[PDB]
Design a protein around this ligand. Structure first.
Ligand SMILES: NC(=O)C1=CN([C@@H]2O[C@H](COP(=O)(O)OP(=O)(O)OC[C@H]3O[C@@H](n4cnc5c(N)ncnc54)[C@H](OP(=O)(O)O)[C@@H]3O)[C@@H](O)[C@H]2O)C=CC1
Ligand SMILES: COc1ccc(C#CCCCC(=O)O)c(Cc2cnc3nc(N)nc(N)c3c2C)c1
Length: 194
């Protein structure tokens, strides 16, 4: 099964500031909730998505939102499911939600932070980035680890047609720039060959 990473980052790959998001974007939060908690209509009795996150990200989420509803949550920590790496998480999942289980696994998302992102980009099953691009240079102190939208990575990572994005996330997604509270930002989907 493939992994998908989902992130919102600035044109300078900023993702974070002071253990939180440096923007308060209500429509971006909804896209995130929607993409990660969406499952092919016919499977939706059985099927559930998984959200894999680092311990720091786990701790950053306002309590009212933990665990993230309607998704299987696994926190990765070297020391709610906990596993010690991405692959341990995958073994826990297959073992726990085995054909003998009534909950089934649809898509598995890596939702942050930088350290987990870095491991997910190293993972041979990761082939898709759902990137929210924020066209401002907001000060940040945590950064996305690999510059997948830059020249150096452009033979590996390709940005897909907007209609391919909508086909994947299964609904109309705004095209182009959305303005909210001082920010322009745009939804993208990038893939690479496995
Ligand atoms: N813009 C966006 O979309 C997002 C931004 N963020 C931002 O990211 C920041 C958090 O990033 P970061 O500090 O790197 O934190 P992470 O959330 O990646 O948490 C780091 C910790 O998780 C565990 N961990 C991470 N990767 C692995 C791995 N490969 N194997 C084993 N354990 C691992 C470790 O926990 P342990 O120390 O317990 O062993 C590590 O100390 C904040 O600024 C947050 O707001 C977060 C999510 C999304
Ligand atoms: C750590 O700093 C954070 C502070 C607050 C929140 C929150 C919240 C409400 C979500 C409710 C729900 O989903 O039910 C988040 C999670 C978040 C947000 N947008 C995100 N946006 C994108 N494009 N990607 C992500 N990975 C996001 C991720 C992890 C991180």
């Amino acid at each position: 099964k493939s992994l998908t990473l989902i992130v919102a980052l600035t044109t300078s790959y900023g993702i974070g500031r002071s253990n939180s998001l440096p923007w308060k974007l209500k429509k971006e939060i909804s896209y995130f909730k929607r993409v990660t908690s969406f499952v092919p209509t016919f499977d939706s009795f059985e099927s559930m998505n998984v959200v894999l996150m680092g311990r720091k990200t786990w701790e950053s989420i306002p309590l009212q939102f933990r665990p993230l509803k309607g998704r299987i949550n696994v926190v990765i920590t070297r020391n709610i499911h906990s596993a010690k790496s991405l692959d341990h998480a995958l073994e826990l999942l297959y073992r726990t939600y085995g054909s003998e289980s009534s909950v089934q696994i649809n898509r598995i998302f890596v939702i942050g932070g930088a350290q987990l992102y870095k491991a997910a980009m190293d993972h041979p099953k990761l082939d898709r980035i759902m990137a929210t691009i924020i066209y401002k240079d907001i000060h940040c102190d945590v950064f996305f680890p690999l510059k997948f939208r830059d020249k150096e990575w452009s033979s590996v990572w390709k940005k897909e047609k907007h209609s391919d994005l909508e086909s994947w996330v299964g609904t109309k997604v705004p095209h182009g720039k959305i303005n909210e509270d001082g920010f322009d930002y745009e939804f993208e989907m990038w893939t690479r060959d496995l």
